[PDB]
Structure formats: C-alpha cells, structure tokens
C-alpha cells in the first residue's frame, strides 16, 4: 500500500468546490437560524417577565402566572415533538451523531420547525435546557436541506455538509467557532471508521456562522469573568484531586438522566396526553422557580460569573448544585426539545467554586482565588459525562479567556475523563444513540 | 452493521490502561529531552556571543569567528545525520508521519543522539531552523523506545504511543499543548484510513510535556505581543485579502523548498565529505548574518515582538522578508536537521505588518493596528504551505493570547488554505514524505 500512499499523499486536501460554497451556504442559514432562535427565546423571557410585573402584588396570583406562563411554552413544545417530530425531542446530539453514522434519518421538513418552535417554548419558558441542543439538530437538518436542495451526490457531500451545519450550530451557541470545529472531529464524527469529512469545509461554515451571529450580537460576552490570577506549579496538583472528583460523579450523573429517562416515561407510558401535560407540569415548576429561586432554574450562564467571582455563600453554592442536578434531569430525561451541554457549564462551575473554596481556607501559602477552580470546573462535567474533553477546554477557554489556566483547565479535565473511564461511565450521547439504536431493534 | 455500532458505542473510549501509564512517561521523557535540548541550543549561541566579545575589535577576525564558530557547528550536525541517521535530515515530522502509516521506520537507537546532538549543532550554530523539528521526531522516538522496551504490544499501542510523544514535541517545542495534540489529529494521523490513537493518550502525554517544560521555562513567554486592539465587523474583509495573498504565497514557497532541495543536491551529488563542507558554508553564513544583520538569520522569534508593535520602517520589513525567504531555503532544503514551522511564523508576521501598514495608511476610518494584521499573518504561511490552519490558528492563539482576533486569524487562515488549494499547492509535510517513499520503491 506504499504506491497508493504516495498517490494518496500528493492528492490529500483536495476538497471538491461545490462542497466548499456550500458550506459557506450552510453556515450562513445556520448563524440566522440560531440568531433567530436567540431572539426568540429572550423575547418571551422577557414577555414572561412583563407578565410578573403586571401581577407583582398578589403573591399567589403571581405564583400562579409565573407557572402557567411556563407550563403553556412547556407544552406546546413537548407536543409539536409528540406529534410530528419524536427526534426532536431531548438534544439533538444523538440524533446528528446518527445520521453521521447513517443509522438516523434527517427529516428537515418537520424538525426545522419542531426544533426551532418546540425548543423556543421550553427553553423560552424558562426550563433548564441549553440552546446549543436545538442549534446543532437544527444545523444538521439545514446542512441536510441544502444537500436535498441542490442534490449533491456523494458520501463526502453528504457527511460534511452534515458535520458543517452541526458545528456551525455549535459556534453560533456559544459565540465560539474553535470548540464547534472541535467537537465535530473529537466527538460527532463516527468514531469507529474512516470518514470523508473535510475539516477546510466545515471552518468555512462555522466561520459564515459566527460572522453572522456577530452581526446580531456584538459587544456583550456570554459569560464575563475578567482576568483571574495564576496558577503556580505547586499548586496543580489540586486540579488533578478536583479532575477525581469529577471523574466519578460523571459516570454517577449519567446513570442519573438515563434511569430518570425511564422513570419518568412511566408516568405517561408514550401517551401524547399525560406526556404534553406532564411537560407543562415540569415547565410551571420551572417558571415558579425562575421567579422563587432564579439560580435553580434556567439556562444557568447568570450565576457563572457570581461563582468566579467568589459572590456565594459555601451554603448556597450547596443548594445550587443540588437543586439544579434535580432541575437539569427533570428537564432532560424528560424528553423536552433542549441540550444538556449548557446546564452542565454551570452545574461544573459552581462543583468547582465549592472546591476552590475549601482549597483557600486549608491552603493560605497557595495564595488561592477560587475562582481559578471554579473555571478549570466549568468544563469538567462535559468532560466526565461527555467525554469531550478537548471541546469543554478550547469552549471553556472561548467563553472565559483566561488562557493562563490551560494547564489547571487541561488537567481537571483529563482527570475528570480518566475517573469517567476507570469507574465504569460512558459517553452520555453514545449511551442515548445507543438505546435508541437498540429500541429500533427491538 | 447496526447492531455493531450499538456493540461501539457502549464500549467507546476505554483505552487500554497500559497505554495510558506509558504515555505519561513518554510525554514526561520527551519533556525533559526537549528542555534539554533548549537549554542545549541557548548554551551554544551564547557561547558564540561571547566569542565575539573577546574579539570585539578586530571587525575581519570577528566576523571571522562569527562564521567559523558557527560553519564547525554546522558542520558536526551535517556529519553525525549524513554518517549515523539520514532520517534525521530536515524536519523530521514527515519521517515521523510516515512512520505512523508504517511506511518509515523509528530507528530510535540512531535517531536519537543525531537528532540531539545533530540538531543542537545547526541551532546553536544560529541556522534558520526551528527545535519543533528535532522536539517531534525525537519525540516520536522516545515514544517507539518505550514501547519497545516495555514491550507493548499491538497496532493502537504502537500508534498511540508514537503519537503522543510527537504531539509532546510541538507542545514542549512551544509551551502550546493545544497545538500539540491538534497536529496530531489535523495532519500527523493517518490520514486516509481508520487508527486506533487515543485522544485522552496523548492528552496525558502533552501535559506531561508541558509540565517538565514549566518546571524548567517558567516566568518567560516565548513570544509576547501585549493586548492588540479589537477588529470591527467592517475590518474583516482586510483578513480575506491577507490569506488570499498568503494563499497565492503557499503553493511558490513550497516548489522552492521543494526545488532548492534538488538544486542543492547537485552541489555534493550526495556525498558525505562535500555535503558537511555545504553545511558549513550555510551555517557559517547564519553565524555571520546573524551578527551583520541578525534579522536574516536565526530562528526569527526576536523579531515578531518587534514586527507586531510596528517598530519596523516598510524598507527593514521587505528586506527581513526576502532576506529569510533566501536563509530559509538555504538552512532547510540543505538536508540541515530542523523544523521549518518557526521560520514561517517569523515570515507570516513580517508579511501581515507590512500588509498591515498599507491598510493603516489607506483606511484611517478603520483605526486599525498594523499588528493585528501580524497576529492574523503569523500563522498564515503554516496555513498556506503545511496546510494545518487549525493548528496554526490555535498555535498562535495560545503563543499570542490575543483572542479578539480570533475571527480575523480564522478568515486569514482559510483564505491562505483555501487559495493553497485553488492555486495546485499541496501539504509540503505531505509533499515530502510523498517524494521520500517515491525514491524508495524507485529501487
Ligand atoms: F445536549
Ligand atoms: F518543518
């Protein structure tokens, strides 16, 4: 096979001109897609918000439109997935995972809208679910639309302009185009054979993407942290404990929304009824939260900056890690259109504040801001429970620039990945294809 | 099939935990060989500076010794690859790419010392060459000795462990982890068929690196650029022009390290004794340049500080420019062991501060930085010619820390890939591991 090498070699990066403009098409619907569904989601938040100002005297009357609010939004998007698009439900990681693999369909006629309206009323209604799960399925599908569109033929077309739309999907959730491009080649490529996947195309998507959120949302960060202090080299060995840490809670989550995935399909057995209206009853309970306790409730990149900042109690960062560990699986296992990544950046942060802290009091010789564990933490539960852990580093460094803990950042994550492996835990979106893959077997 | 799939997914990212232990103690040997050999390098070059001081007078003895001091140098490096280890000429990742398509052997008992000794010659010496190459091949060697002598078996152990101590080298080579382990996956990997690497593996291996190189580098930035300012919305279509003209650039140099490299062939038709007397030339060459005029020659970091904050006139820009592009393919086609990446970071800053200058004067409206335009250059040529803008990108990102440029670095990098690509250029690395296995099975 040396002959074809050598043909191989001379020929490598060759990437057909039809697949390079229509990935630039690609990113593009897909950055106004996602800055659509941006727009979306913060408008009915904030009409939800008026809404509690035009009742904010009677308590219980107040208690009650914050729940209704919710439960409605809830609903109508559980329901728009029940009845027309059931792989629209949960993230859409899995599902695009699937058609990379060419084991899921794309059904961009119903998805397109299932997603983008269904995920615009759960996550609208305040339930605490991440945008990135809606913008990736909705990037695949709209890569798979430009595919039918134009009728490209080809395997390589057909992958890419796939793996295109989902980091394009990716990037313009986040405003980071590095840990899209990133999390196509480290996590939704399929990871057991040889793809056609060109990394040049895909870049050229993510890039439109981002150039076209940025039309729409310059000048305000996703999450501001300014620049935190340093890392000595003695004191990394406590981002190594804090990786251990998250190493076996990892695997102890993902059992969690898997087991909880099954607990609660008993409350509605698959009936399109008790289900609509058990998603209105976790949507109410969201929207009742979002106004009683915000920080257990929601997307959750609010109290991201709070915990850097050293702004919480011992004490509240306890109830906030255990009441948003209940609100994040009720509202995942649950079915509703929304990802899980987002909810896991703040569940990671606050892990890791609650760690720095108790690392200052028994470590004043380190000079320690908790905070520096706090961002080594952000990305430690994608990287424990995903297994991504090259995406939750360049993410988490995209979102946070504090590039001075690459190293505390690097190992956490590592140590959270090797914890993850050893004790038994598996990739969360490869273990929800898999059930899925199963069942369709079944 | 399905069923199968369902088999892999429940069984994803279980990596035998024996590789796992042994890449820590690759990533930790290619570490301190890489600090080693930094200090090795820093050593020599200051060594041939105080030489210049005792005779700091007579200016014909003094560019004398200049030369001399650098030509024997060179010349040792030469000898002990042409003599002991051929493989150990040039670069150094197209042997350890071939390698890892088991197309090249790891003669790590050779390679070893030649590249070591071989590389610490040419460097210290003041050649236009960067210690990423000597860091990766040696690096990937290390990797093939542990294996060996642990006696590790299988092709994901082989393959796995190869890797992690090349990304070990570039992540030791320039205090940039990232880039490590991204130019194994963007470039040194196989890249038409299926592997069994293990991308938590070579993680391990890179913070292993990283760590014996921080316990030994710390308080100091190999490069360091300060804050640049922001790029408005309406300043990026400059970013496009760039990689485009880095774009049309990419394909030219690579026929020329290409061409030089037969050209220079001729000069000794192969033969050890006219090839180290080559090599001393050259490098006695570099020893001079770099004292007349030390812009032209060395390894080029010195000047992009300077470039970027634009303490540069548009003249001295040019000529540090043409001047490399001459003492880059002279020190590298020559067969000199030595990576090519660093000098092309030093020529893409060059290249973007002088577009950079142009767009300043020509569009006051924009409030521009030539060193923005540096930043989003830096790594362009690496983009163009190696045809890894991820790795570029990310190199510099994490060598500059100036992440508002971002998108500006992206659309430089893509437009310079992409240009490369419509222009008929090819992967160089590619190119010439292309090349070396054509004049193998030429029997
Ligand atoms: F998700
Ligand atoms: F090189």
Same mark, same amino acid.
């Given at each position: 096979?040396?002959?074809?090498?050598?043909?191989?070699?001379?020929?490598?990066? @060759?990437?057909?001109?039809?697949?390079?403009?229509?990935? =630039?098409?690609?990113?593009?619907?897909?950055?106004? =897609?996602?800055?659509?569904?941006?727009?979306?989601?913060?408008? $009915?938040?904030?009409?939800?918000?008026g809404a509690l100002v035009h009742t904010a005297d009677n308590y219980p009357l107040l208690l009650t439109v914050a729940f209704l609010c919710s439960a409605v939004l809830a609903m109508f998007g559980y329901f728009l997935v029940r009845k027309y698009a059931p792989e629209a439900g949960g993230s859409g990681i899995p599902e695009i995972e699937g058609a990379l693999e060419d084991q899921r369909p794309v059904r961009?006629?119903?998805?397109?809208?299932?997603?983008?309206?269904?995920?615009?009323?759960?996550?609208?209604?305040?339930?605490?679910?991440?945008?990135?799960?809606?913008?990736?399925?909705?990037?695949?599908?709209?890569?798979?639309?430009?595919?039918?569109?134009?009728?490209? @033929?080809?395997?390589?077309?057909?992958?890419? $302009?796939?793996?295109?739309?989902?980091?394009?999907?990716?990037?313009?959730?986040?405003?980071?185009?590095?840990?899209?491009?990133?999390?196509?080649?480290?996590?939704?490529?399929?990871?057991?054979?040889?793809?056609?996947?060109?990394? @040049?195309?895909?870049?050229?998507?993510?890039?439109?993407?981002?150039i076209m959120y940025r039309i729409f949302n310059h000048e305000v960060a996703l999450i501001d942290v300014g620049k935190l202090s340093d890392a000595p080299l003695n004191t990394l060995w406590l981002y190594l404990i804090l990786g251990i840490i998250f190493g076996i809670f990892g695997p102890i989550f993902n059992k969690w929304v898997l087991g909880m995935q099954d607990l609660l399909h008993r409350v509605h057995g698959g009936n399109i009824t008790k289900w609509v209206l058990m998603g209105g009853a976790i949507g109410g309970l969201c929207?009742?939260?979002?106004?009683?306790?915000?920080?257990?409730?929601?997307?959750?990149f609010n109290l991201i900056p709070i915990a850097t900042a050293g702004n919480?109690?011992?004490?509240?960062?306890?109830?906030?890690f255990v009441a948003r560990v209940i609100t994040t699986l009720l509202c995942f296992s649950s079915g509703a259109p929304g990802g899980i990544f987002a909810p896991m950046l703040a569940l990671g942060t606050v892990l890791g504040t609650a760690f720095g802290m108790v690392a200052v009091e028994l470590f004043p010789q380190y000079h320690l801001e908790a905070g520096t564990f706090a961002i080594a933490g952000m990305g430690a539960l994608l990287a424990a429970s995903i297994r991504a852990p090259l995406?939750?580093?360049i993410l988490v460094?995209?979102?946070?620039?504090?590039?001075?803990?690459?190293?505390?950042?690097?190992?956490?994550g590592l140590g959270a990945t090797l914890l993850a492996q050893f004790t038994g835990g598996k990739p969360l979106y490869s273990a929800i294809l898999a059930r899925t893959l199963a069942k369709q077997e079944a």
């Open positions: 096979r040396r002959r074809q090498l050598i043909r191989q070699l001379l020929e490598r990066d @060759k990437t057909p001109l039809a697949i390079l403009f229509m990935a =630039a098409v690609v990113g593009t619907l897909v950055g106004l =897609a996602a800055v659509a569904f941006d727009k979306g989601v913060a408008w $009915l938040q904030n009409q939800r918000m961009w006629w119903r998805v397109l809208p299932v997603k983008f309206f269904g995920g615009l009323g759960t996550l609208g209604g305040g339930m605490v679910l991440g945008r990135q799960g809606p913008t990736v399925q909705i990037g695949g599908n709209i890569g798979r639309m430009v595919l039918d569109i134009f009728r490209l @033929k080809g395997d390589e077309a057909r992958h890419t $302009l796939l793996a295109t739309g989902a980091a394009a999907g990716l990037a313009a959730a986040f405003n980071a185009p590095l840990a899209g491009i990133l999390f196509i080649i480290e996590e939704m490529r399929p990871q057991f054979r040889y793809t056609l996947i060109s990394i @040049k195309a895909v870049f050229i998507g993510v890039i439109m993407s981002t929207g009742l939260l979002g106004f009683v306790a915000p920080a257990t409730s929601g997307g959750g919480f109690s011992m004490g509240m960062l306890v109830f906030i995406t939750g580093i460094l995209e979102m946070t620039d504090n590039y001075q803990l690459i190293l505390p950042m690097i190992i956490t």
